[PDB]
């Protein structure tokens, strides 16, 4: 159960980062990170897939209700690979990922605010920031985490967000999933060299997941070892 | 600048279509729009033209377009937000597949599971050209009137 919660994020992920690490500002604010970079990045055979990530909170006008909300330019595999359940609708095709449709995913709570009526979501349009957006899918949270006190959150194909309501080449991050059952330790340094190449400087700054995965795996199985062993010893004593 | 003036006998709209779609949008194509504040009160008219000079909001260039809506009763304040529907073509007598259940092998080939009269779902490869914001105009490989398991489809799966 707990591993399924953990492996729910698969194998693996190398989110791309600027600056130095998590706490950095200006060097992290600047991003020499073309989404085009992914091309050659996706070119490596061991990789199964790798995906762009970006997000922007913006004001959202609508009919009468008129409030800002966070939003998330992402892959269509997002709710898929996260396995996030849908309140309604689906994610989106890669074709329409290229289609730049004004399709979009929203919080159920966001609907709770927008829609006292509980009107059907699909086919409806609501502007984000400025651009009109024909809402379709909305997804229920797959975690409780009530202490998070989650606010309004929204999801877009990244091509649309970063594209036709941002236009920057530099997305917040890029997920990178390896194939082959390949080890987390290896190649991440090779990708590091890769960023030492396609960029001229030490700018990978990425975090990684079979490291923490394998170690918590050894941890849990170790707990199995202690528990089952002392149990069986006691029973043999019986 | 002592004082500004404006003629409100008719209202012009600045419909900022994205640069990706500007290549289409032939003049005189019929279009309609509606304001956020009145929810449902459609206005409509001919498109007039396209402005030669773009202006941008950081990322992504946008090109304007204009109408010429009549303004009875003194409604529509200046710079009011207005959602705008511009019309592309209406080819007819042809099926379009909802995108919710599409299968797309190769990214060219396109399998699609559909329920049969037997209660057996079965997929078929199909070719499709035209694509829509919501669906895709299928051209071959599926009959009209066919049941189509839009939700949680799998091939060969009798229900």
């Amino acid at each position: 159960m707990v591993l399924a919660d953990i492996r729910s994020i698969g194998t693996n992920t190398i989110d791309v980062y600027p600056g130095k690490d998590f706490g950095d500002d200006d060097p992290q604010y600047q991003q020499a990170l073309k989404y085009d970079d992914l091309i050659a990045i996706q070119k490596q055979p061991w990789v199964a897939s790798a995906t762009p990530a970006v997000s922007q909170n913006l004001r959202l006008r609508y009919n009468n209700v008129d409030v800002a909300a966070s939003a998330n330019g992402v892959s269509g595999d997002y709710f898929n690979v996260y396995g996030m359940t849908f309140s309604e609708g689906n994610t989106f095709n890669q074709e329409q990922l290229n289609g730049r449709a004004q399709v979009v995913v929203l919080d159920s709570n966001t609907r709770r605010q927008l829609f006292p009526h509980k009107a059907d979501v699909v086919g409806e349009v609501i502007l984000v920031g400025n651009m009109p957006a024909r809402v379709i899918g909305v997804a229920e949270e797959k975690q409780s985490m009530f202490g998070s006190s989650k606010v309004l959150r929204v999801w877009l194909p990244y091509s649309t967000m970063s594209g036709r309501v941002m236009g920057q080449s530099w997305l917040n991050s890029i997920t990178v999933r390896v194939k082959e059952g390949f080890d987390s330790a290896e190649a991440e340094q090779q990708l590091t060299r890769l960023l030492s190449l396609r960029h001229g400087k030490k700018d990978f700054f990425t975090w990684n997941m079979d490291g923490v995965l394998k170690t918590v795996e050894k941890t849990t199985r170790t707990l199995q070892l202690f528990l089952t062993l002392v149990a069986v010893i006691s029973l043999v004593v019986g | 600048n002592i004082l500004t003036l404006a003629d409100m006998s008719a209202m012009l709209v600045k419909a900022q279509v994205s640069e990706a779609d500007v290549i289409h949008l032939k003049p005189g194509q019929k279009a309609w729009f509606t304001v956020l504040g009145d929810q449902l009160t459609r206005y409509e008219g001919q498109i007039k033209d396209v402005l030669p000079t773009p202006e941008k909001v950081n990322d992504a260039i946008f090109y304007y377009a204009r109408f010429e809506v009549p303004n009875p009763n003194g409604l529509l304040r200046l710079d009011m937000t207005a959602q705008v529907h511009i019309q592309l073509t209406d080819v007819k007598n042809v099926l379009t597949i909802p995108l919710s259940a599409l299968g797309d092998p190769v990214g060219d080939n396109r399998y699609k599971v559909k329920l049969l009269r037997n209660g057996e779902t079965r997929e078929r490869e199909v070719t499709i050209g035209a694509r829509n914001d919501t669906d895709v105009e299928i051209v071959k490989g599926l009959e009209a009137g066919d049941e189509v398991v839009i939700g949680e489809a799998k091939p060969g799966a009798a229900q």
Binding site: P132 | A65, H85, Q87, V94, L95, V149, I150
Partner: peptide, 22 residues
Amino acid sequence: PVPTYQTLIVRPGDLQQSVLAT
């Protein structure tokens, strides 16, 4: 486990491609 499937009746439809814009 119910094999229940959401489904639709396809018909010779007419194209409604036009898009939108703020």
